[PDB]
Ligand binder design. Structure first.
Ligand code: K
Ligand code: K
Ligand code: K
Ligand code: K
Ligand code: K
Ligand code: K
Ligand code: K
Ligand code: K
Ligand code: K
Ligand code: K
Ligand code: K
Ligand code: K
Ligand code: K
Lengths: 182, 83, 58, 125, 74, 108, 48
RNA sequence: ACGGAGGGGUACACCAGACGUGGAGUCUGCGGCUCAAUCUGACCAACGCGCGCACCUCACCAGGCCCGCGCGGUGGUGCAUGGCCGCUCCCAGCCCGUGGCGCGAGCCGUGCUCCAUUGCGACAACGAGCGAGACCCCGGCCGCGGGCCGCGGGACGGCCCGCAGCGGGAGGACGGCGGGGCGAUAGCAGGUCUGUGAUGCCCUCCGCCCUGGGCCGCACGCGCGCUACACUGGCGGGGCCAGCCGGCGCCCGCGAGGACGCGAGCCCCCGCCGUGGCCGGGACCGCGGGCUGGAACGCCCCCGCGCACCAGGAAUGUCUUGUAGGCGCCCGCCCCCACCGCG
């Protein structure tokens, strides 16, 4: 039995991710890895404040190192951008079209956004804005597609938003469908 | 205003110019894991420290997480007579 | 299987018009000249190629 | 030195053949005395000193693994010859399972029923 | 003499790690599994989620740094 | 060897070649609802247990390993039927009789 | 003052939400099936 | 949309069969009744469903502490909402750019075949995408490597016959690969605020805890199941084989069950009983002995007591290979305990 140790490592990695999703919302959290914790984030320059005081305070709130990479393409990640839609709440059409446009310039090959809540007159409906090509079936869904959903604590009722980004082009494996013949 | 020693040990788990940080498991042993005064003595006062803003909090899986401010550390300067 | 999708057939056309010379009316050999991101996909496209050859001869 | 295997469902039979034992109990003393015939079929339709170790599954599978092992272990006796080519022919004209293993295995259970096809009764009232 | 136990959940990472340790130089797989009703409450067709998790040993009775890999020596 | 003769002959012809009183008012287990009937059964059980030991030449068998060797079902209970073990005192005592290491016992 | 929490019983609740009911303790997961679905994904449990 | 309208397809929906269910006792859920409370949801797609009720879990009842002896709330509102789920549907469908027709709602794009809007080929339409397929997982046969695990090969409607493809043969481990995972657009005033630091708006300050009880009460009608109704059987002694992975020696004690320590059932063989509610069937009850636990009302074991039941009306369900069915084992909730569910 060498596996209690590793399983508790997994559950504590879940801990650190969810805590970071509660807290580092200010600085575009994405994800973290456990090893010496190495963190995928959207700007490190604030998570390290002046004189690293806050970063050290966090490390010592992981007792009761921390080193951080950079998200090179901000708009490809369905997490900091769904936080962006959290921020913009300002008209729905324009908010979600900016949400799409940033991803499409950043290099998404498909993108779309779903919104549901009491938008007009005491009734929930569901908007769906969209741009480009998307897929939803089989194993490649878990590689190339990316989904993220967020609750919003509105003045009136809660607002659910989903951002879905499709990248069939990464530096990696080739889709079983596309067979470039030359 | 219950126990002056209790309400000083709870501050003692704050390194003032250093960077310790506090967490709280809210059982509601029966003593804390940090020093050994009771969870209850920690919890009653930490409500007030939240109201004042000597410290701020987030929360994740039944576990209070705190972090110390500028103004709160100023407040503690005089309660521990440091410089 | 029975029916081949247009992905397979679209492949088979370009492949055979590009290697009319190299292709024989057998399957083992035609595999090499097709050797796509999967080996079963390879298998199916080569299966259609092996038929296109003995259909273009006659 | 000769190696041979035999399979039925989860039954694995190992045979060392050299110029007859099944689980240390000789041929005609293996438990199912009715299926003893079924075991002894190849020997009489077609010695050396063979030796077997077999486990897995149940009685009938043990039988269909040891029998098939002994068939292969004397099929590999002569080499590169017309006997090497016609023994397997008499074995097939007895049963093709006397060479090639049977590939059937139980299909897994799926929720909402006791087995692989039986559901539970559907009552509207 | 020295004992090495090296463990990880992802077969690719584990195989890489054994491949890049011999660049220097029965405990089989078992699986951690659960089944559980898909829905929150108890209404509708009884469908089930079946979760699964295999994790591996590699044994090195000795006579790269990969995050998610676990090592003990004893 | 002994293997070259069958067991259903060995047990009987060896009980015919061989003694507590708890033999009376005892069933062979909580499975069996009646005590056995052929009052030679204690000789027969003893010959069985020794025919089962001499098989195991190297490793040490045990007495729970022997009650688990002699098991059957429990029924008349309205429920799906479960397998139960036999008694322990009987087999331990038969082993002690036939006895005159690290664990259990062994042959010779 | 001398009655508050006398009784002894299992203190079994989920570690993520706080539900007294329907907690898995296999392997020592100490969590509930509802909570399990939205956090098992990265604790590691996957579907095949 | 629908038609007791025509035409073309298809599925265990029917055919041919098999195994059942409805008739008995029994476990479990629902109603209705009773109650200080018997907390509550849901009526194909509610009803072994909301993961195992002595205490806690508990939302409900009889009492009692805190702040006998703003804040919290398992309060409401799923017809105020988010996410997850079910279902229409695992159906084969959905839809864009430029052009054409029309005042416009709109239309166009969108025979031969396959499991399939899969394709052939034709066309005021040309050209793309999703869903389908591909993909992932498991399991069959064969190689190199390590010491079974982990890296690759192999199967394709390929061969030979008869008329995009329907047929017949051959070889091979497997023949048209097999069991599963995932799953389009559009939605339904299904279900779920009682799973959560999801939550708007109302009401309570109904918060937390302590003891005792109830949810398990019972003429009664439902549903899912378990053991039967025997001779293709029951009983007594013996033989011996699994897989999902897994501790057992010394003893005591009829047994169950204690104190101390260390690393499979069917089936087969041989006998008995002899068509008799019999030795089928094992409910209901009367003593004892044990385990859990602060606490038995929970569970085991020993003797005795031997109910109903003779194959079940009107009705009704499921299934094509290691499949139905028979046999048993294991994991979940779990102080103890499976008749349940996942295997
Ligand atoms: K249900
Ligand atoms: K149900
Ligand atoms: K109570
Ligand atoms: K025209
Ligand atoms: K017009
Ligand atoms: K159209
Ligand atoms: K047309
Ligand atoms: K047309
Ligand atoms: K036209
Ligand atoms: K290896
Ligand atoms: K390996
Ligand atoms: K909810
Ligand atoms: K209150």
């Amino acid at each position: 039995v060498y596996y209690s140790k590793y399983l508790n490592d997994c559950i504590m990695e879940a801990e650190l991710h969810e805590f970071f999703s509660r807290e580092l919302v200010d600085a575009g959290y994405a994800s973290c890895s456990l090893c010496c914790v190495i963190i995928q984030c959207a700007e490190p320059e604030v998570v390290m404040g002046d004189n690293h005081y806050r970063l050290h305070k966090i490390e010592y709130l992981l007792a009761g190192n921390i080193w951080v990479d950079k998200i090179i393409k901000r708009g490809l990640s369905a997490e900091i951008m769904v936080d962006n839609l959290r921020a913009k709440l300002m008209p729905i059409r324009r908010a979600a079209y900016s949400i799409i446009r940033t991803a499409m310039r950043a290099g998404a090959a498909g993108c779309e956004v779903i919104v549901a809540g009491k938008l007009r007159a005491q009734r929930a409906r569901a908007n769906k804005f969209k741009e480009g090509c998307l897929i939803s079936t089989g194993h490649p869904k878990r590689i190339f597609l990316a989904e993220a959903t967020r609750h919003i604590k509105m003045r009136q009722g809660v607002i659910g938003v989903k951002v879905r980004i499709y990248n069939p082009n990464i530096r990696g494996a080739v889709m079983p469908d596309k067979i470039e013949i030359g | 205003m219950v126990h002056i020693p209790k309400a000083v040990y709870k501050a003692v788990y704050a390194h003032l110019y250093e960077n310790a940080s506090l967490a709280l498991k809210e059982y509601w042993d029966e003593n804390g894991k940090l020093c050994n005064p009771t969870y209850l003595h920690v919890n009653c006062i930490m409500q007030s420290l939240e109201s004042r803003g000597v410290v701020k909090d987030t929360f994740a899986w039944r576990h209070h997480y705190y972090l110390l401010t500028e103004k709160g550390e100023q407040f503690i300067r005089k309660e521990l007579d440091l410089t | 299987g029975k029916v081949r999708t247009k992905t397979i057939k679209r492949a088979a056309r370009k492949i055979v018009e590009n290697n009319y010379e190299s292709l024989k009316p057998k399957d083992f050999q035609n595999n090499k000249a097709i050797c796509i991101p999967s080996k079963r996909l390879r298998n199916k496209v080569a299966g259609y190629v092996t038929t296109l050859m003995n259909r273009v001869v006659k | 030195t000769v190696h041979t295997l035999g399979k039925k469902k989860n039954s694995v039979a190992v045979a060392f053949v050299k110029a007859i034992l099944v689980n240390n109990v000789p041929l005609a003393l293996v438990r199912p005395e009715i299926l003893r015939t079924k075991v002894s079929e190849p020997i009489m339709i077609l010695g050396l000193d063979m030796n077997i170790k077999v486990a897995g599954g149940g009685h009938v599978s043990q039988i269909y693994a040891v029998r098939q092992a002994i068939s292969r272990g004397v099929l590999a006796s002569v080499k590169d010859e017309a006997a090497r080519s016609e023994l397997r022919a008499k074995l097939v004209s007895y049963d093709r399972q006397l060479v090639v293993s049977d590939p059937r295995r139980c299909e897994a259970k799926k929720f909402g029923g006791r087995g692989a096809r039986a559901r539970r009764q559907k009552s509207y009232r | 003499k020295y004992t090495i136990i090296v463990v990880g959940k992802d077969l690719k990472l584990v195989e890489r790690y054994v491949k890049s340790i011999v660049k220097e130089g029965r405990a089989p797989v078992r699986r951690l599994t659960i089944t559980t009703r898909k829905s929150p409450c108890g209404e509708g067709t009884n469908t089930w989620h079946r979760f699964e998790l295999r994790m591996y040993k590699r044994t090195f009775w000795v006579t790269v740094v990969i995050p998610g890999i676990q090592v003990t020596v004893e | 060897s002994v293997t070259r003769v069958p067991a259903d002959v060995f047990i009987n012809s060896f009980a015919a070649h061989l003694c507590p009183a708890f033999t009376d008012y005892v069933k062979t287990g909580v499975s069996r609802q009646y005590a056995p009937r052929d009052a030679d059964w204690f000789y027969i059980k003893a010959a069985s247990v020794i025919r089962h030991f001499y098989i195991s030449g190297s490793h040490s068998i045990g007495v729970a390993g022997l009650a688990r060797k002699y098991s059957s079902l429990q029924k008349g209970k309205t429920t799906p039927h479960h397998t139960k073990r036999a008694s322990c005192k009987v087999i331990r005592s038969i082993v002690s009789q036939f006895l005159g290491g690290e664990r259990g016992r062994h042959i010779s | 003052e001398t009655e508050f929490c006398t009784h002894i019983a299992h203190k079994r609740e989920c570690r993520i939400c706080g539900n007294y009911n329907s907690v898995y303790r296999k392997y020592g997961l100490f969590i509930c099936r509802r909570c399990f679905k939205e956090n098992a994904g990265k604790i590691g449990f996957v579907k095949l």
